């Protein structure tokens, strides 16, 4: 497994047959295993694209790995999804797991569907980053923080309080799956594509203000495209 040496203002791969002493490992604290946000590769954050990035496969049992300090993740996800018979889907997070330290917009999902597989699997082999443990599998509850890890040889309340967007799912683990944003006990908006958490945040311009606000015993679910809001377009 390669590590990058920082030298002459660039990274250098460590899997070489010569150990030049221009760089010295004076201590173990020059070593790093830092996590990276997958999103930093320009990777889409759409909740449907996230589903598209996961394998939804039963398989060889999951593993996690300890990893180092690193960049904030703008988008991350939480999951409550269950199989159509109401059975649990995807293992619960292991003890001591907590959501990633800095996700700015954790997206949470709820509802049921086939939710194929037991261990999902990131299709890129990318690791979910839960707190300090990278993972090969999605865990229920805590924040996914998709990302990758690199090893290196070295020479304000919003930091945790930021987070928006929770939604229902219809079906799961397949690209027929639907996701609906929910605010003020109103389920709405399939999320189309290309919607930032902030785009969705802007939809709260309708909460107790611009339209929406069902007048009935419960929510009516508008179908997203006022055109976007899809007011009175719940069927």
């Amino acid at each position, epitope marked *: 497994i390669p590590l990058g040496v920082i030298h002459n203002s660039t990274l250098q791969v460590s899997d070489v047959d010569k150990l030049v002493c221009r760089d010295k490992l004076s201590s173990t604290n020059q070593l790093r295993s830092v996590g990276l946000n997958l999103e930093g590769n320009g990777v889409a954050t759409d909740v449907p694209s996230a589903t598209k990035r996961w394998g939804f496969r039963s398989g060889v049992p999951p593993k996690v790995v300890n990893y180092e300090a690193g960049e904030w993740a703008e988008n991350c996800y939480n999951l409550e999804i269950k*199989k*159509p*018979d*109401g059975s649990e889907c995807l293992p619960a997070a292991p003890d001591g797991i907590r959501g990633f330290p800095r996700c700015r917009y954790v997206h949470k999902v*709820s*509802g*049921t569907g086939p939710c194929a597989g037991d261990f999902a699997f990131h299709k890129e082999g990318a690791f979910f980053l839960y707190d300090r443990l990278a993972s090969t599998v999605i865990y229920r509850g805590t924040t996914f923080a998709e990302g990758v890890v690199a090893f290196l040889i070295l020479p304000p309340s919003s930091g945790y309080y930021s987070t928006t967007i929770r939604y*229902q799912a*219809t*079906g799961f683990g397949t690209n027929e799956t*639907e996701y*609906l944003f929910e605010v003020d006990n109103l*389920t709405y908006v399939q999320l189309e594509s290309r919607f930032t958490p902030q785009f969705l945040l802007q939809l709260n311009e309708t909460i107790y203000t611009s339209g929406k606000r069902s*007048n*009935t*015993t*419960g*929510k*009516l*679910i508008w179908k997203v495209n006022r055109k976007i809001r899809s007011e*009175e377009l*719940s*069927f």
Partner: nanobody
Amino acid sequence: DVKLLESGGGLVQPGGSLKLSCAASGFSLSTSGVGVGWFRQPSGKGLEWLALIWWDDDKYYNPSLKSQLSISKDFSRNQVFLKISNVDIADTATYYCARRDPFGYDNAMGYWGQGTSVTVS
């Protein structure tokens, strides 16, 4: 067009308990916002509310009966259920399952199950 189907108890002793169920043979109930529910009409009485169930995982009960009533569902089989603690003569009624009919705007549920009844003795 949904073949919502009734299920429930036959004649039972009073002071017992009864589980009731239904299913949507004509529909998956997979659309988000599908709502189904229960009501009853004892003695030719109007539509007493019993319960509301959403496939969005929302449940509601008629508070007067809620203390002895529980809602359950099974999406894999398009099922909805009620469990009634303490069934007695006051609970004898005709019963129906119901579904949104205009569907998704102003409730409108509206659509009915076959109709069933429960009696005690």
